[PDB]
Design a protein around this ligand. Structure first.
Ligand SMILES: [Cl-]
Ligand SMILES: [Zn+2]
Ligand SMILES: [Zn+2]
Lengths: 396, 49
């Protein structure tokens, strides 16, 4: 991995720094590293495999070194370097794709493709130089059992889930009490509905709880909390739990009462926010507990009092909401996020070569299935393929 | 003035390079290049630069 990354980084530096007219002293160390890579790779035969529709490709390395002959680089030097760099970049991209399309149940973090297994030999270790990118840095630290994290903007931590719970229900679905929620990506939009508007509640208070267990621990998370859930504030015709029939939802939005967001780690109260909205910070957590109350307004204007009668039928259903958005976080494990392209890159490579479903990942690299059952083996394989994808992104 | 066992063609080039190296108005980059510029002898290819 470090050798493959070092090849990619050397090639990127060569493409960016070996430019016409540049001082010889701008590239001396780069030329030395590039010649070291050429020497190490010369005389070695590589094969990128024929898994799926990925074509089998054979790579031979017999390239002359780069000289150091002009004070300012000229077009001839750049052209020779470009020829060598193009061949090497093609080889590295093919190696990255081959590694990306494989997986293993037992040693998911270890190399899978023959080319990357060969590049893990001692003879190629000389190619290894600066490992500065976030993913390679995390890879190297993780190999040493050191604490490190990936920073995600809008981490895709919640598997898609749009469902409801009815705590009070009837066959006619006309006096319902329960909760709706959408947990999608970095967003949790929850709502608690009472059709009776807590007319018969002990203190005209109906308590609602939503507990979301994160599949991985998130640290240093910045979170936006908003009182209302816009997704559950318009009339809906909703299938029953079995799908036998459909019931009617006609929300009227009330201010959430006694709102408490608890971010829990190991069952301990790490962070607590009571009636606080806007931007909040969750230090380090793996569970979110949103508890909110629907309180019947003690004093109502005649129209509001007309909305909520003392008994059935109930045509306007009182709803309290909550929206939680993880704008950024840090996770010890790799995750899909809104800014990076690693999941997109791996999925595109797997789809474009018709890679058969393996024993580790879900079909089509479906992210909801992947995060739903985010096992340690899947974590290892995903980290491997994401690191390879980030290596490939430096050139392709 | 080569720091890597450098050679030049021909002796007149050596005289010119020494004079430029010792000159005080020479650019530091030019001086460092004179000290670092190298020949390349590829005996397997039967080529010399
Ligand atoms: Cl955004
Ligand atoms: Zn953004
Ligand atoms: Zn139902």
């Amino acid at each position: 991995m470090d050798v493959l990354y070092s090849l990619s980084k050397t090639l990127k530096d060569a493409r960016d720094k070996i430019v016409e007219g540049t001082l010889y002293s701008n590239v001396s160390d780069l030329i030395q590293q590039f010649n070291q890579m050429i020497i190490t790779m010369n005389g070695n035969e590589f094969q990128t495999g024929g898994i799926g529709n990925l074509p089998i490709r054979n790579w031979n390395f017999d390239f002359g070194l780069l000289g150091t002959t002009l004070l300012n680089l000229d077009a001839n030097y750049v052209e020779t370097a470009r020829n060598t760099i193009d061949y090497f970049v093609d080889f590295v991209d093919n190696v990255c794709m081959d590694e990306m399309v494989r997986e293993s149940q037992r040693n998911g973090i270890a190399p899978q493709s023959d080319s990357l297994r060969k590049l893990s030999g001692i003879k190629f270790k000389r190619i290894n130089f600066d490992n500065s990118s976030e993913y390679i840095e995390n890879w190297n630290l993780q190999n040493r059992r050191q604490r490190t994290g990936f920073t995600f903007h809008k981490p895709n931590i919640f598997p898609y889930s749009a469902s409801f719970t009815l705590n009070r229900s009837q066959p006619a679905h006309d006096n319902l009490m329960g909760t709706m929620w959408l947990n999608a990506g970095s967003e949790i939009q929850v709502a608690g509905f009472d059709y009776s508007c807590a007319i018969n509640a002990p203190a005209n208070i109906q308590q609602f709880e939503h507990i979301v267990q994160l599949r991985r621990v998130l640290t240093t998370a910045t979170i936006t909390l908003l009182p209302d859930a816009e997704r559950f504030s318009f009339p809906r015709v909703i299938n029953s739990a079995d799908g036998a029939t459909t019931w009617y939802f006609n929300p009227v939005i009330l201010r959430p009462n006694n709102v408490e967001v608890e971010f829990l780690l190991n069952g301990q109260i790490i962070n607590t926010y009571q009636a606080r909205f806007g931007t909040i910070i969750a230090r380090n957590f793996d569970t979110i507990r949103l508890s909110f109350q629907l309180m019947r307004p003690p004093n109502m204007t005649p129209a509001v009092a007309a909305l909520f009668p003392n008994a059935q039928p109930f045509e306007h259903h009182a709803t309290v909401g909550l929206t939680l958005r993880i704008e950024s976080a840090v996770c010890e494990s790799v995750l899909a996020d809104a800014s990076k392209t690693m999941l997109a890159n791996v999925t595109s490579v797997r789809q474009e070569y018709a890679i058969p479903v393996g024993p580790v990942f879900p079909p089509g690299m479906n992210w909801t299935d992947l995060i739903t059952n985010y096992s340690p083996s899947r974590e290892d394989n995903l980290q491997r393929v994401f690191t390879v994808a980030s290596i490939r992104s430096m050139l392709v | 003035n080569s720091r890597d066992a450098g050679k030049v063609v021909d002796s007149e080039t050596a005289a010119i390079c020494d004079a430029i190296f010792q000159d005080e108005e020479t650019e530091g980059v030019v001086r460092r290049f004179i000290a670092e510029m190298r020949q390349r002898v590829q005996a397997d290819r039967n080529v010399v630069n």
